[PDB]
Design goal:
The complex is a heterohexamer, with three copies of chain A and three copies of chain B.
Chain A: E1 12-15, E2 20-24, E3 27-29, E4 31-32, E5 39-40, E6 46-48, H1 56-59, E7 74-77, E8 88-90, H2 93-101, E9 106-110, E10 124-128, E11 132-133, E12 138-140, E13 153-158, E14 165-173, H3 177-184, E15 191-195, E16 198-202, E17 218-226, E18 231-236, E19 240-243, E20 245-249, E21 254-257, E22 262-263, E23 270-272, E24 275-276, E25 283-284, E26 291-292, E27 296-297, E28 304-306
Parallel strand pairs in A: 4-25, 5-22, 6-7, 7-21, 8-17, 25-27
Antiparallel strand pairs in A: 1-2, 3-28, 9-20, 10-11, 12-19, 13-18, 14-17, 14-19, 15-16, 15-18, 23-24, 23-26
Chain B: H1 4-8, H2 37-54, H3 74-121, E1 129-131, E2 137-139, H4 147-152, H5 162-166
Antiparallel strand pairs in B: 1-2
The chains are: A mainly beta, B mainly alpha.
Bound molecules: a molecule of 2 linked components (GAL-SIA) (3 copies) and 2-acetamido-2-deoxy-beta-D-glucopyranose (9 copies).
Chain lengths: 314, 168, 314, 168, 314, 168
C-alpha cells in the first residue's frame, strides 16, 4: 500500500523564512487593499458640517447657524467649510479642532454679560443674514458714537457647571489707526484675560491687510477652557469681540475629514479621506492616516499567508 | 521539516480531492484511491487556528493628529510625520516577519502530518510488510478490499495475518 | 517495555500560534500586575517636595525655603505643591520641570546686582514669613516713593562657571494703570533680555484678574539658561521682578509624581503615581506612564508562558 | 510536531512524579514504573533557558514627558498620547506573538524529547523486540528486573540476548 | 556503513531561544559597527555650506554670497556656519532649516518694492564687503535724515509663481529709545503682516543687549510661505528690515550636519555627523540619529546569525 | 529538534571538508571518508535563503528632526528623544528576537537534514542491514567500493543482494 498528499495544477507562491515564491496549495491575503469610497455611518449619530467650519460652530458665522448646538458620534469636516465670515483666524486652532472632534457636540449657555454706555450691535457685509450681521455667538463692542471713547470695562463669568466652559473672544485689528479710533476712540487699547489657571493679555495691531471676503481688517480669535467654579475676567477698553455665549462638551465622538458621501447602509469604524476601510485583516495599504479602529498600515501591497502544504506536481 | 512532502515521496495527487492525505493501493481487483480524514482534519484545524488568530479587533481607537485641509505648523508637523514613518517601518517589518515565520511553520506542519500518518500505518502492519521507500508498503500477504479497508480505518490485525507473510 | 510521559489532574490553559486554551503541565505569568503602593526609595538620596512646587525651588516662596538648594537622586512632586505665593505662573513651565527633574538638585549663587535710586524691599501678605514677605530668590524692584519714577536701568550678569546658569525674572502685572504708576511711575514700561544665544522683550499688561491667594495682580515668570562665559543683560524701567540668585544643576536625578508614601525598606527603579513596580517580567499592565526602568506596558492583563508539555489525562 | 505526546501514545501518567519521561514494564515479578533523567533533564534545561531569556534588565531609563497634576498644552499633549498609544499597540502585539510562538515551540520541544527517548530504546533492543504501536515494546525473550535496568540505563546487550528471541 | 556531519576546532558561539553561547560551525554579523569617516557623496550634487549658515542663504550675509541661489541633492551644514552678520536670530528657526534641508536649493526673485521719501542704504561694520554693508537680500529702511520721521508705508507682493514664495523680513531692535528715534523718528513703531493664510504684527523692543560681533542691537528675523496667487502685505512705520528678494524651492534634497570631509570616491545613502554608513546589514550601533536610508539603530554591539549547524568536536 | 547532530551521533568529523554531510565505511580494502552533495547543498541553499532575507533596501528615507549644533526647544526636544528611545527599544528587541528565533531554526534545520539523509539510506538497504545506533549500518553481506558507491549515489539494489545477507 502507498500513500501521498494532494496537489494542484496552478498553486500560490508565498514567501518563507528561507525562500521567496515557494508554491503552496492555498493562500489568503493579509493586507487590506479594498476601499469603500463612502462614509459608512450606519447606526451612528452623524453630523456633516459641509460649509460650516468646525471652529465656526463655536463663534457662529452664518454657515454655522444650524450647527451652534450639534450632537454627534461622528463629525465630518469638509474642504468647503469655513470657520469665518469676517476674515480672521484662531490662535492654537488645531488643538481646538481636536477638542471639538472628540466632544460629542456642544451645548451653549448665556454668559450673562450686560453693557451700559457703549454700542453693541456691530456688524458687517461679510456676515450676511437679513443684511449685514456678525458672528451669532459674539458681540462686536463699540464706542457709542462715530468717534467717542471706550470706558475701560470689566466683565466676569463664573462656570457654575460641573464641566469646563469653552470661552472664546476676539481681538479686532482695524485697517488703520484712523479706523481704530473711529470705532473705539484713541490710545493704546488693551485686553487682559485671567483665570485661576490662565494668564494672558492683548493689544490690537491695526494696519492694512489684503482683502478677504471684501475686507482688509482681521479678527483674532482666542480661547480658554474654564474649569468648574473657576472664574474668568475680561479687562478691556476696545478692539474687543465679546463672547455672548459659552460652550460645553456633550460627551464623546470621533472627527474625520472626507470628500466622499455618507452611507447609512454600511457600518464602518475605520475611516479616511477617501472612505471607509471595512476589514478583518491585521494590516492595510490604503491610507497611513486612517483613523478610528483600523488595521495597521504597512508599506507592502500584499503579504500572502499559507493555508496549505507545499504544492508538488508530477 | 520532516522529509515527506517534497521529501522521499516524489509528488502529489492532483486527483485526490476528498482530503489532504489519502490511500492508494495496487492489488488484483482493479484499483482504489482514497482519503484519510483524521490526518486531513487535524492539519486543517491547525491552519484554521492560525488564520483565526490573525483576525482580531483592536478596540483601540486612534484620532486625527494631523490636518489635510489646513497644514499644522511645520515643526510639529515634521515630528508627527517622522513618528508616523518610524511606526510604519515597525509594522511593515512585523507583518513581513509574521507571515514568513507563519508560512515556514505551516509548511513544516503539513509535512509533519504526512509523516505521522505514514509512520503509524507502518506500525500497524508490523512485520507483515516492508517500506518500499517512496511512501509505499509491499504487503507480503496479498491484501484485498476488506483488508485494505481494515488498514485505512485502523483495524488490521497485526498478527492474524503474520506468518502467512513471514515466510515470504 | 512501554514508555510514556507525566500528566496532571488540573493543568494550565495557554495560547499558541495555532490554538487558544491548550492545556500544558505548568505555566508562568509574563505580565506584571502586582503593585507596591509605596515609593520604594531604599539606598537613594530622595527629596519629597510636599507643599513646595518644583518651580518654587528656583524662585523661593515660603513653602520652598527648605528646598532652595536641594540635592537628590530622586525627586517627588506632590499634588499639594505650589510654585507660587503671590499668584502668577511660568512661561514654558513644563520644559523647566523636566529640566529640574533630572538635575540632581540645585546650587544657588548671588548674581551680585546692586541698586541705587529705587526701592528694593517690595513684599505682600501672599508670601507670609514673619509678616509680609516675597519670593526669597527674587527682588521686587520699585520706584522710591509712593509714586515717583523709575530710571531705565541695566543690570548684567556673567556666568563665570563651567555650567549653564538658570536665570529667572518676573514681570509684574498690576490690577490697573493706576496701580502700575503708584508702583513704577507712568508710561509704557519695557523689559528687554538678551544673551549671546537669547533674544526677547516684555511689556506689562495691567488689568483686574480674579483673586488668587487674596490677590488680583499677577507675576509672569520667565527664564533662560546662560551658557558659560556668555553674559545676559536686563534692560528695564519697571514692572520687573529682579533675580537675586542664579541656579546651577548639581548632576543627575529622576523626578516622579506620586500620592503614596516613601519606604526606605524596599528598593525600586520603576515608578508611577500609585507606587513602585518591582518585577523581572518583560511586561506590565499597571500604568502606561510608569517611569524609570520598567517592563514594557501592554494592554493584556495576562499572557501565560508554557513551562511544560501538553497535559493529556486518561 | 513529532507525534508522540498526544500522538500514538494515548495519554500521560499522573503517577509519574519522579520526572517528565519514564519507564513502565509488565513482566512476571510484579511491576515497576520508573523515571528517565537525561530526557527529563534536557527538556527541563531548555524550558529553563527560554524562561531565563525573558527575564532581563533594561538599563534603559524613561522620564516623564507628561504631567498629571498640571496638564500640558493640548496640541503637544495629543501628539504625546498618540505616540504612547502607537507604542503600546506595538508592545501588546510583540508580547502576544512572542508568547504564542514560544509556547508552540515549547510544546513541540517536549514532544521531541519523547520521540528521541523512544527511538533510541528501539535502537537498543535491535531485533530482540517489536514496536507495539502505543509506545510499547514486546520483548521476545522475557526480560527481568536486571534486564529492565540494563535498558533503563543503556547497557542491554543488543546481541547477547538475540537468537533466544529471534526464533520466537 | 556509517554517516556523520562535519565539525571544526574553533567554532562561533551564538544565542538561541533556549540558550546563550551555543557554538555553531559558522556565523555572520547582523549589526553594523563599521563607519567610514567621510561624507560619501559620489554622484550627488553636493553643497558644503562651510561658514555660511543655512538660514543665511535666504537673508544673505557675506559668508553666504556664493550660496544665494544654490542647487543640491545633498546639503552639508558645518559647525563654523553662521546665519548672521549683524547679530540677531530667526523666529521658528528650526522649522525653516528642515524646509531648506529638503528644498533642493533656492531660486531668488525680486519682489519689486520701490521706495520714496525714506533712506534705503542702511549698513554696518558687522557685515563687511568693500567696507560696511548689510544682508544682500534685505533692505535696511531708514528715516531720510539723522533724525526725521518715517511715513507709515504699505508694500505688497503677489506670488505670481506656481509655488510657495518664502518671504522674510526683519525687525530692528536698537540699543535705546534714543537710537530708535535717531534712526526711525519717535513714537511706538508698528509692523503688521498678513496674507490670505497668515496674520501677525510686531513692535520693536529697544534696550542694551550684550555685544555680538561688536554690536549691541539685534535684528529679529521672521518669515512666511506665500501660496500661489495669494498676496502678502507689509504695513510698517519703522524698525523694519525690508525683503528685497523672495525665495523659491527648487525641488528635493537631504540635509545633514557633519564635521568630516567630502569624498566623491565613495557612494553613501546613510549619513551622520561622523561620516557615512555603507552596509547591507538590517541593523547598526553607530549613531541613533543617522539620516537618509539607514539600517535600524539598535543598542547591541553585536548579534551573530547562525550560518551552520551546531559544532560538536570529539 | 530531530536527535541526530549532538543526538545519538556522538560527534562531528573535523576532516570532512568536502561538504556538510558525508559517508565513511569500514571494509576490507582500507578506508574511505566521502561527502554527500544533495544533503549538503539543500541545507546550504536554506541558510543562504535566510541570510538573503535579512539583507534588504529600505527606500525609506528619514530626515533630521533634531539639531546638534543648535539645540531645539527643550519641550519638543524631550518629546523627540523620548520617541527615539522608545523606537530604539522596539528595534533592539526585534533584532534580538529575530536572531535568536532564526538561529534556533537554523540549528534544528541542519539536524533535520542529517536525519533525512540517514533515514533514506536506511530505506535503501531494506533488510540487508541493521541500525547500529550511532548512525552506523552493519551490512550483513560484505559490500565493497562498488557497492559502497552504489549506496552513496542511490543505486544499491534493495533485493539483488538480499538473501545472501538474510540468512546471516
Ligand atoms: C461695526 C462696524 O464698524 N462695521 C462696519 C465695518 C467695519 O468698520 C470694518 O469691518 C472694520 O474694519 O465696515 C463695513 O464696511 C466696510 C467697507 O469698507 C470699504 O472700504 C470697502 O470698500 C468695503 O468692501 C467694505 O469692506 C463692513 O461691512 O464691515 C460696514 C460696517 O458697518
Ligand atoms: C510692593 C507692594 O506694593 N506691595 C503691596 C502689594 C502690591 O501693591 C500688590 O500686590 C500689587 O498688585 O499689595 C499688598 O496688599 C494688597 C491688598 O489689596 C487690597 O485691595 C486687597 O483687598 C487685599 O486683599 C490685598 O491684596 C500685598 O500684600 O500684596 C500690600 C503690599 O504692601
Ligand atoms: C543704518 C545705521 O544706522 N547703521 C549704523 C549702525 C547702526 O546705527 C546700529 O547697528 C544700530 O544699532 O551702527 C554702526 O556703528 C555702530 C557702532 O556703535 C558704537 O557704539 C560701537 O562702539 C561700535 O562698535 C559700533 O557698533 C554699525 O556699523 O552698525 C554704524 C552704521 O552706520
Ligand atoms: C483558500 O484559502 C482561503 C483561506 O482559508 C479559503 O477562503 C478558501 O476556502 C481556500 N480554498 C480552498 C481550496 O478551500
Ligand atoms: C463649587 O460649587 C459649589 C456649589 O455652590 C460650591 O459650594 C463650592 O465652593 C465650589 N467648589 C469649590 C472648588 O470650592
Ligand atoms: C507630513 O506628511 C504628509 C504625507 O503623509 C505630507 O503631505 C506633509 O507635507 C507632511 N507635513 C509637513 C509639515 O511637511
Ligand atoms: C510552574 O512554573 C514556574 C516557572 O517555571 C515554576 O516556578 C514552578 O516550579 C512550576 N511548577 C512546578 C511543577 O515545578
Ligand atoms: C571662559 O573663561 C575663561 C577664564 O577667564 C576665559 O579665559 C575665556 O575667554 C572664556 N572662554 C571663552 C568662550 O572665550
Ligand atoms: C493623554 O492621555 C491621558 C491618559 O493616558 C489623558 O488623561 C489625557 O487627557 C490626555 N491628554 C490630553 C492633552 O488630552
Ligand atoms: C561564514 O559565514 C559567512 C556568511 O555565510 C560567509 O561569508 C563565509 O563564507 C562563512 N565561512 C565559510 C566556512 O564558508
Ligand atoms: C492664479 O493666476 C491665474 C493667472 O493669472 C489667475 O487667472 C487666477 O485667478 C489665479 N488663481 C486663483 C487662485 O484664483
Ligand atoms: C536629546 O538626546 C540627545 C542625545 O541623543 C541629547 O544630547 C540631548 O540633550 C537631548 N535633547 C534635549 C532637549 O535634552
Amino acid at each position: 500500500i502507498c500513500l501521498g498528499h494532494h496537489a494542484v495544477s496552478n498553486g500560490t507562491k508565498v514567501n518563507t523564512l528561507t525562500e521567496r515564491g515557494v508554491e503552496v496549495v492555498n493562500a489568503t491575503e493579509t493586507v487590506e487593499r479594498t476601499n469603500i469610497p463612502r462614509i459608512c455611518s450606519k447606526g451612528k449619530r452623524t453630523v456633516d458640517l459641509g460649509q460650516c467650519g468646525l471652529l465656526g460652530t463655536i463663534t457662529g458665522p452664518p454657515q454655522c447657524d444650524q450647527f451652534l448646538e450639534f450632537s454627534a458620534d461622528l463629525i465630518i469636516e469638509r474642504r468647503e467649510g469655513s470657520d469665518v465670515c469676517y476674515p480672521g483666524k484662531f490662535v492654537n486652532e488645531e488643538a481646538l479642532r481636536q477638542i471639538l472632534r472628540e466632544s460629542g457636540g456642544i451645548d451653549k449657555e448665556a454668559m450673562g454679560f450686560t453693557y451700559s454706555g457703549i454700542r453693541t450691535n456691530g456688524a458687517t457685509s461679510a456676515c450676511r443674514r437679513s443684511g449685514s450681521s456678525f458672528y451669532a455667538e459674539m458681540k462686536w463692542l463699540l464706542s457709542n458714537t462715530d468717534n467717542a471713547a471706550f470706558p475701560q470695562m470689566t466683565k466676569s463669568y463664573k462656570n457654575t457647571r460641573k464641566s469646563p466652559a469653552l470661552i472664546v473672544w476676539g481681538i479686532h485689528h482695524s485697517v488703520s489707526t484712523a479706523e481704530q479710533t473711529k470705532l473705539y476712540g484713541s490710545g493704546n487699547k488693551l485686553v487682559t484675560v485671567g483665570s485661576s489657571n490662565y494668564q494672558q493679555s492683548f493689544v490690537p495691531s491695526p494696519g492694512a491687510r489684503p482683502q478677504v471676503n471684501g475686507q482688509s481688517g482681521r479678527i483674532d480669535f482666542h480661547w480658554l477652557m474654564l474649569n468648574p467654579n473657576d472664574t474668568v475676567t475680561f479687562s478691556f477698553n476696545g478692539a474687543f469681540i465679546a463672547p455672548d455665549r459659552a460652550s460645553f462638551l456633550r460627551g464623546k465622538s470621533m472627527g474625520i475629514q472626507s470628500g466622499v458621501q455618507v452611507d447609512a447602509n454600511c457600518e464602518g469604524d475605520c475611516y479616511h479621506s477617501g472612505g471607509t476601510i471595512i476589514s478583518n485583516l491585521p494590516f492595510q495599504n490604503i491610507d497611513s492616516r486612517a483613523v478610528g479602529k483600523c488595521p495597521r498600515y504597512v508599506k507592502q501591497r500584499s503579504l500572502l499567508l499559507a493555508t496549505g502544504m507545499k504544492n508538488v506536481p508530477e | 521539516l520532516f522529509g515527506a512532502i517534497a521529501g522521499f515521496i516524489e509528488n502529489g495527487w492532483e486527483g485526490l480531492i476528498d482530503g489532504w492525505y489519502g490511500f492508494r493501493h495496487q492489488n488484483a481487483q482493479g484499483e482504489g484511491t482514497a482519503a484519510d480524514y483524521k490526518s486531513t482534519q487535524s492539519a486543517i484545524d491547525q491552519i484554521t487556528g492560525k488564520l483565526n488568530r490573525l483576525i482580531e479587533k483592536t478596540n483601540q481607537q486612534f484620532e486625527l493628529i494631523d490636518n489635510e485641509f489646513n497644514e499644522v505648523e511645520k515643526q510639529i508637523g515634521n515630528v508627527i510625520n517622522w513618528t508616523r514613518d518610524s511606526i510604519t517601518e515597525v509594522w511593515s517589518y512585523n507583518a513581513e516577519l509574521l507571515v514568513a515565520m507563519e508560512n515556514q511553520h505551516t509548511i513544516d506542519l503539513a509535512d509533519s502530518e504526512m509523516d505521522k500518518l505514514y509512520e503509524r500505518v507502518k506500525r500497524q502492519l508490523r512485520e507483515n510488510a516492508e517500506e518500499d521507500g517512496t511512501g509505499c508498503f509491499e504487503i507480503f500477504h496479498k491484501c484485498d478490499d476488506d483488508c485494505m479497508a481494515s488498514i485505512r480505518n485502523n483495524t488490521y490485525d497485526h498478527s492474524k495475518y503474520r506468518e502467512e507473510a513471514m515466510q515470504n
